[PDB]
């Protein structure tokens, strides 16, 4: 949906 995602340890 064009929004950044990443591995859960980032927040």
């Amino acid at each position: 949906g064009d929004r950044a995602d990443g591995q859960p340890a980032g927040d």
Partner: antibody
Amino acid sequence: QLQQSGPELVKPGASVKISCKASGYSFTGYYMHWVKQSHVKSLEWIGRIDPYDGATSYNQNFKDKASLTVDKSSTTGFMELHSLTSEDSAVYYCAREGHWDGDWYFDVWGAGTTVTVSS
Amino acid sequence: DIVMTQTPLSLSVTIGQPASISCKSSQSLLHSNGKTYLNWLQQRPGQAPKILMYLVSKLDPGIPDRFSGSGSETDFTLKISRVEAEDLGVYYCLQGTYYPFTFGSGTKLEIKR
């Protein structure tokens, strides 16, 4: 790629702002994270910023120490490090958290900015 | 924060021979969503760290297939089936399951020739 700013001499107690210019991908599409590499080669994650809205998430150990900002119009991310001591001499990396085949991991790194804290 | 302990802390492997590096995490890295966020990076002298493997075993597409990873929820092994000159440097595990991200201390590989 990611292009970091050059190395820095900083007086103790002073601050410095280092930068990380992104090119060739959609800036607001990916988290930009920052990693400290101490001279004994230990890596520690500092935090990350969402370049779309400026939202930051910090490693608790760097809360008072680092602040992440971004300039959309220059697709450049910034880390300012505050009130520096001997323990803040190190190499600082920025890294993009990218995606491949539906998973996320750090897939582009800047080359490092060496900060030396010294009077 | 999660503690990542690597062993051995250094090793020296003859060109063409196998290498094995392990990592243990102080808690299960198996997330609620079924994924296990355990990564391996290599840092060659003069370069930035680089992700070799994510999700315990999934090879980045630019990484040669002599690299492979295995693991349970807490212990992990990176294997190189036959080391080459470019495999030198420091190898790190990294967990992304629990905030905050944490790395191991690094294992320095020397290539014996």
